[PDB]
């Protein structure tokens, strides 16, 4: 495929182009050495025995004239196999940061992990252990056909006529064996997917007294699939064993007619041997390499997943936002539409957030709220419409301008293994220690530093002291506060068991001296009561827009949401006085 000539490293296209023809003549030299077995053994005893090793001196010419060309192909392939080993994983590594994060599915992240980890020595001996043994063994049955032409043409074209029928026969045996492993992996998956389902629902089944009714239904469904498997073994391998039989039927076949339908050629018992050395390495390696052919073809395809389908964000670096740098910008959505595949997430949204204020986005978990922040931050781009920061399209921004424009507090802390101070300095590594101290204090990370013997130098990875969810969040808030971006986004997912984490979010929104346009997807009244504007997002559309006091006076969707969140904080088990029968409130 074009999989390998994608992995061809620069400065080495001449070493692979020479390799292409330098390994091609080796197949030509082993083809003349095979047809040189025709006369050498025909004179060794058949007629006029012992001829003083004439053709042996000419076969010793082509044997070690192949030794010279093959002592470089492996050596060249060894360095060529390491050159692709180096260029491949480096290119995929430098390409992943510039991938639209919509691409990072749970599965595409698993294939990307395989491509950049489990592809070490397999790519090292890629060419020498499979590419050169396959390129050679695929053209040898046709190489002797042109190397036998000068001995006999009715015997020569009969090889090129018989080389196309046996390749297709194996191509059908390899297709029957490939179509048989598919159904094999499907039934066993259907076998085990019922075992997994009965295991994950064991609590619900036992609590509902449905454990035995489901025990028999799965036991019989597995007993029926067990029967369907037995009948498909009877009518399948009557063909597989036939094709290695088909390998030895052509051997004794031609050797069984060249013995009786000839009579005029008892020097043609090298012909039974010449036909053998043509079929010695035909389906002997082809079956021995067909197990490692897709085992090396799809690691070139999961590798093809990263680079061929980069899905790199457009990011045309046309602008740098060098207007009012460091000033809180306005945020504008102009007919912004977004879809994850085929489902609509944002269905034409238009609003304009005035610069300097803070907006709270609420809504029934439609995942559009979080999408609104991703489009502002630049993690994703709108399918149609524009997102403008002070009238400048976020997609028209330079990579360094879009990176330094938005600061984000994700739902997850996203902390790396290292010192606690290093996880905060990610927001600004060259920031003065006064700014780092203020960020960790406003985020209330200093409350955590007291219980740490090493302070902010305490390593928080797996080899160090562990942090709780609320503490990890406060570290993430300090990281976002430390970055001097004129925009701050909070995808609120704060711990309900940490009053310091709840107070750190409020402080980060209301006690930050830096002018920032702030947007927060929040659920607590303590975090949204300070907002100047509320966007109620429902079914991919902004169905309410206004200030807190005026939305509460309208008595609509946000008014009910506010009253429910208020009652949720005052909630206590067994405190409604059995008044649930009348109002259901």
């Amino acid at each position: 495929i074009r999989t390998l000539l994608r992995l061809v490293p620069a400065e080495k296209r001449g070493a692979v182009a020479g390799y292409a023809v330098l390994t091609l003549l080796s197949v030509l030299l082993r083809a003349v050495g095979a047809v040189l077995l025709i006369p050498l053994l025909a004179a060794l005893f058949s007629d006029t025995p012992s001829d003083a090793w004439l053709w042996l001196g000419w076969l010793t010419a082509v044997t070690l004239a192949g030794w010279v060309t093959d002592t470089n192909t492996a050596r060249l392939g060894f360095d060529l196999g390491f050159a692709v080993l180096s260029r491949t994983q480096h290119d995929m590594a430098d390409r992943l940061p510039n991938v639209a994060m919509s691409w990072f599915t749970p599965d595409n992240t698993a294939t990307a992990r395989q491509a950049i980890a489990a592809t070490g020595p397999e790519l090292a001996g890629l060419v020498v252990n499979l590419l050169t043994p396959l390129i050679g063994a695929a053209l040898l049955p046709a190489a002797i056909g042109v190397a036998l032409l000068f001995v006999s043409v009715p015997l020569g074209l009969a090889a090129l006529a018989g080389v196309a029928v046996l390749f297709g026969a194996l191509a059908l045996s390899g297709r029957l064996s490939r179509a048989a492993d598919k159904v094999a992996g499907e039934t066993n998956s259907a076998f085990t997917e019922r075992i997994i389902e009965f295991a994950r629902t064991q609590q619900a089944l036992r609590a509902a007294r449905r454990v035995e009714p489901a025990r028999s239904q799965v036991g019989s469904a597995l007993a029926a699939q067990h029967g369907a498997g037995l009948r498909l073994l009877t009518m399948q391998i009557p063909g597989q064993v036939l094709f290695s039989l088909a390998g030895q039927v052509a051997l004794i076949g031609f050797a069984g007619m060249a013995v009786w339908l000839t009579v005029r050629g008892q020097l043609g018992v090298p012909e039974a041997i010449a036909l053998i050395v043509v079929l010695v390495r035909y389906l002997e390696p082809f079956a021995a390499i067909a197990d490692l052919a897709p085992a090396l073809e799809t690691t070139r395809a999961t590798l093809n997943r990263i680079q061929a389908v980069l899905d790199a964000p457009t990011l045309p670096a046309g602008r740098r936002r060098l207007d009012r740098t460091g000033a809180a910008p306005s945020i504008e959505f102009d007919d912004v539409r977004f879809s994850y595949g085929d489902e609509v997430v944002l269905d034409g949204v238009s609003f304009t957030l005035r610069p300097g204020n803070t907006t709270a986005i609420v809504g029934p978990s439609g995942s559009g709220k979080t999408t609104i922040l991703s489009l502002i931050a630049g993690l994703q781009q709108p399918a149609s419409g524009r997102v403008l920061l002070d009238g400048v399209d976020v997609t028209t921004l330079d990579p360094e301008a879009r990176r330094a424009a938005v600061s984000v507090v994700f739902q997850h802390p996203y902390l790396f293994d290292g010192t606690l101070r290093d996880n905060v300095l990610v927001g600004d590594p060259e920031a003065d220690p006064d700014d780092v101290t203020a960020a960790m204090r406003l985020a209330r990370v200093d409350e955590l530093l007291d219980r740490l013997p090493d302070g902010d130098a305490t390593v928080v990875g797996e080899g160090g002291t562990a942090l709780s969810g609320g503490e990890r969040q406060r570290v993430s808030i300090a990281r976002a506060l430390l970055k001097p971006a004129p925009v701050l986004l909070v995808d609120e997912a704060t711990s309900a068991l940490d009053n310091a984490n709840e107070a750190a979010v409020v402080d980060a929104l209301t006690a930050d001296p830096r002018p920032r346009t702030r947007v927060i997807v929040a659920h607590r009244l303590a975090s949204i009561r300070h907002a100047d504007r509320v966007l109620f997002v429902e079914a991919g559309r902004v169905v309410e827009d206004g200030a807190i006091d005026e939305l509460l006076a309208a008595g609509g969707r946000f008014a009910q949401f506010w009253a429910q969140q208020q009652a949720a904080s005052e909630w206590a088990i067994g405190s409604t006085a059995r008044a649930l029968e009348v109002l259901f409130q």
């Epitope: 204020n357 203020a438 204090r441 406003l442 209301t510 006690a511 930050d512 001296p513 009561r529 300070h530 100047d532 504007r533 200030a547 807190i548 006091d549 509460l552």
Partner: nanobody
């Protein structure tokens, strides 16, 4: 009314380059320790830009990159005023300086309070 916000600026005037000035903002109607106080400046014909701001708690200070290291903001709760000592005054700092406080917290649309500003002219 009796709790009416009022901000007045002072300390401006003409001073040649390399000099220093100290601005003051006498606030009224609200505690300066409750909200965040910000210093703005606006040259004639151009849009206003923030210069520095101080936290409500009093420890978090931020400065614009064009004044950081030369300008310093501080607060005196006892007199309820805000200070801005600007050293190494470059002619780019010639503008009308204002102090700002915003009425947030109250579940309404935030309203900005401004003063009449003080003129700061610096010649080279």
């Amino acid at each position: 009314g009796p709790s009416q916000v009022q901000l007045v600026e002072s300390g401006g005037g003409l001073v040649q380059a390399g000099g220093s000035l100290r601005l003051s903002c006498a606030a009224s109607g609200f505690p300066v320790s409750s909200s965040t106080m910000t210093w703005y400046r606006q040259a004639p014909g151009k849009e206003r830009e923030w210069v520095a701001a101080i936290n409500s708690y009093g420890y978090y200070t931020v400065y614009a990159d064009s004044v950081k290291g030369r300008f310093t903001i501080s607060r005196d709760n006892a007199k309820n005023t805000v200070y801005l000592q600007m050293n190494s005054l470059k002619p780019e700092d010639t503008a009308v300086y204002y102090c700002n406080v915003k009425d947030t917290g109250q579940m309404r649309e935030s309203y900005d309070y401004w003063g009449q500003g003080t003129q700061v002219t610096v010649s080279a």
